[PDB]
Design a protein around this ligand. Sequence first.
Ligand SMILES: Nc1ncnc2c1ncn2[C@@H]1O[C@H](COP(=O)(O)OP(=O)(O)OP(O)(O)=S)[C@@H](O)[C@H]1O
Ligand SMILES: Nc1ncnc2c1ncn2[C@@H]1O[C@H](COP(=O)(O)OP(=O)(O)OP(O)(O)=S)[C@@H](O)[C@H]1O
Ligand SMILES: [Mg+2]
Ligand SMILES: [Mg+2]
Lengths: 460, 106, 494
Amino acid sequence: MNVTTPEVAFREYQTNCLASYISADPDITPSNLILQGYSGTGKTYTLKKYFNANPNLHAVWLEPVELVSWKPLLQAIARTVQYKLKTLYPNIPTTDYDPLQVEEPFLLVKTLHNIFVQYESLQEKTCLFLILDGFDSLQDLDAALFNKYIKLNELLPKDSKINIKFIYTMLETSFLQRYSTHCIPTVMFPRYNVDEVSTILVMSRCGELMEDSCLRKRIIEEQITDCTDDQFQNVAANFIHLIVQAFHSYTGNDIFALNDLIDFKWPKYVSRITKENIFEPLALYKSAIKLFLSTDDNLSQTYDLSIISKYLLIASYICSYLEPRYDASIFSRKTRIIQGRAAYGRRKKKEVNPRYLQPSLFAIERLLAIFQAIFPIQGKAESGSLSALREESLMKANIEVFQNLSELHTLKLIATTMNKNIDYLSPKVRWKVNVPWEIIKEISESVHFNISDYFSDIHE
Amino acid sequence: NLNRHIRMNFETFRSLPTLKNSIIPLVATSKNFGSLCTAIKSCSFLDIYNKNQLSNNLTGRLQSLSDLELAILISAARVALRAKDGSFNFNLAYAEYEKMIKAINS
Amino acid sequence: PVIRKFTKKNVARAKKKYTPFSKRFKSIAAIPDLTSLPEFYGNSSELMASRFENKLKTTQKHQIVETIFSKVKKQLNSSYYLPARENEFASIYLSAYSAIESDSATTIYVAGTPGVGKTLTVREVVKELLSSSAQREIPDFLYVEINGLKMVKPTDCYETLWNKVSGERLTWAASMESLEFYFKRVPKNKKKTIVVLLDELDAMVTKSQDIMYNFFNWTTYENAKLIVIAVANTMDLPERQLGNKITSRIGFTRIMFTGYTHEELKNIIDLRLKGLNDSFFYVDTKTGNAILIDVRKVRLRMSADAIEIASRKVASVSGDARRALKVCKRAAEIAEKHYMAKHGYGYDGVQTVHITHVMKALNETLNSHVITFMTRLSFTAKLFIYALLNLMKKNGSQEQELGDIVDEIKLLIEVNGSNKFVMEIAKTLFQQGSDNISEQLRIISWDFVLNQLLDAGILFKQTMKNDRICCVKLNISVEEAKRAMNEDETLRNL
DNA sequence: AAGGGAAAATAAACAATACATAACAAAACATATAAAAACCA
Ligand SMILES: Nc1ncnc2c1ncn2[C@@H]1O[C@H](COP(=O)(O)OP(=O)(O)OP(O)(O)=S)[C@@H](O)[C@H]1O
Ligand SMILES: Nc1ncnc2c1ncn2[C@@H]1O[C@H](COP(=O)(O)OP(=O)(O)OP(O)(O)=S)[C@@H](O)[C@H]1O
Ligand SMILES: [Mg+2]
Ligand SMILES: [Mg+2]
């Protein structure tokens, strides 16, 4: 045409289609265009690099992720279109329309109709590209909003001098397949290879890894001043090829997860270089082996709970994964004055391992029964017949057991069935724990309680 | 070859605006008349176009996965086949993952 | 000022007063004679309603051709003496003549299925007793059209009635207190009788039923001179909304209009053709313009059995006069376009409307198009329906899982691999024709034809984001889906 | 010490109830403007 195609690295098909649909002449440009790709696939990179290589065709860049609802999205369109045209044509006399006055999808059309008729003295047809960059990332999004922006071209005047053009950017391809019968052109941005991620990450980050002060400071301060830029570039490039080849299987074909694992592990990789480490790359990798094996993407006891709050999550974890039918066989200890048979226990093991499954609901009285079954002995016997009757060696539910059970519920460590204004004080309300096994195992080793023996006999 | 791409449209989409979006960058991305006369004889762009439109649908995303991402996707697909509701957890799909890596290394 | 939490920058408020009519004369004895008062009863409002005729006028007119069939379509319009509602005219006119002559108040309730002449004949009642009142055998009255579907809000009937009575623009909560003080407190010597037509009373009472009570309770008053002709659709709308003790207290008449018979449709259609049927026109042979009594003396008869079968078919279904006047208007333009195509007049021995023009006009409104639509879809779209119909005879569950449809489409190309059509299409339906595209999970244009059938209304799909366990109904029938797929050649053999 | 035999456990088909969420209603919270109503003056 009359347009310039930039050289984006691994997007050479996508840029030729992007130069095919976007042009200055409004007759040969579609009024809608989707650039679909997933995250990190380089579709705001080459969209930006296309418009920088073509300065005489005009663009309005909007991010629909920082606008959250449909109504600020309409208001930002009315604000940034007229603010673009004031910088773009200062010689045109205009009266500013309040962008906060649009409250409807039609009041946008009426406002854009009023903005565009006062630029009618222009010399030729001109298209302004309204780039909705991340339209699918709008939080309140529904199915009936994107086909409300497809059809704005038909409600705006056909012989205006300014023809607004929509360029959409979206992610998830189930949103895009809802609008397949509109037959509006789409350029797909597929995920990169492992070789395409590494080449992009090495041309994006070798500049910053030189101007980083940590590599800058050490080489003069270690008193090994025998290096050039071509070794400086090759020592940072070989780190990136080594930080990908270790952690590609963890991240995948991301760009933003690789960019975090570089700068979390580049200050730790610089501080292990000396004279034998710049020149030979294999020797430096064995001297920095402990930061290429573990990711460490994380930032006494896990909880500072009370000593009876700590046994009341344990009893919550028992009630919600052991079954109520087998509790008399496990916890009963006391001698029988009156004849009766104890519970026999589970006859055969289950191979489901219920701790994998979602926790089941229990009643409030079963929790308080298993609580005093497992709580340690309070008021220990002091070898006195005068003292042994009064002691009540087993713990009853005082005001603190219920206060700590209610505190354990406000901390979202015990759950209920979800109804708005549940009442604690009701027969129907049942309870369940929501902590994982890895938390209740850390809890049980603090109070020296062996919770694993209660679950070893069921399958493990 | 051009009448072959029309016949595929007639059997699958049967909509002329879908073929219309295919011809537009076959013409606009042609540098001279020697390449614009060639590109409608061969229609080698329309194979490249139809590959793009369908390059991250669900086959193109599965082919863009690493080895751990593929192993967890298989492991969650074996738990979802044994389950009666087709359902699984992260705990169930890591249990099937770790007994898979044991049986490979054994 | 203060920082506002949200803005309303498009509020447009009407200049309507707040104080009702009960607070502007300070005494019932100080109320003047309202009939000899200038702003009441619409004595100055006849200037602004006639303002908008000048907006749609333009001075260009270049000899539009008025052919033989254009005169018939002009005369079969619904806007253009009525034969088949005579006992219903004589019931509404008798009930309203007695209440106006006696300075009384009443309510007339009239219902029926749509299109049976009840908005027409109530306006013909009040036009007869306007002419009776203009001759001074009943006193003068004021007539108000209230249409429930010509209102934005249901409460706008209070505003529009009190505006027609008094010429005053008040809000609705001030208009019903203005009307209620008007009907029970103002004396009968100071008022004028008011005949209000509450047309389409269904639409006003859907949300709160506070509006049907007030108009009927105002007619029970002694001082009120109010005749509410309340035309609705169903006959039990008073007793469902108000109750049994309220509708017995009011004591209104209750008329139902039955839909017309086929012999009554013939005396409506042929009544609007008395000036044109069996009549002579002057048609010039170079422009096509007809003139009622280079030029032939052509004439025009319409077949009586054509009006017969247009009356037998319409009256057997609904019985409304609109569907019969526009099945004969539709037949009159089918006959025009063949007259317009034979001679080629365009726009600037004997003509007739046959039995085949009326049948063609009548068949196109009674046929369905879901047969003709689905026989001309893609192979892909017809393969989607054919896989869905196999699943509804393996189970009969009539809403199939969408992943069961995908595996059926793959199994149906699996098994029929010896077929001549399926060998050559399965390359162009999994790889889309050439190499370098991998073999894929969904057929090519699976998202296109699933959305094509949901947009058309053929197919219902529930809302699930798991694209595989989602369920899919039909919306047409299982019979007329199978009828469309046993016509296609390649699917019925496999 | 053996053993009977009733309590306890398991399983499976079926019925009855609870639960998560969709759809909505309504009250609290909020602003706007023309008409009334004080109110200086
Ligand atoms: N082909 C490429 N050549 C060079 N740098 C690239 C290329 N593709 C991506 N990048 C860089 O990698 C990062 C990718 O960011 P973006 O292009 O903004 O991703 P994206 O496609 O917009 O995905 P989302 O939806 O915004 S998370 C940026 O820092 C780009 O500069
Ligand atoms: N008996 C009749 N004689 C002549 N023309 C009639 C007759 N009945 C109906 N029409 C015509 O058909 C039109 C139908 O109007 P109506 O039937 O009065 O409206 P309607 O009964 O209120 O139906 P709605 O509004 O849906 S409840 C009239 O405007 C006339 O043109
Ligand atoms: Mg982006
Ligand atoms: Mg009517």
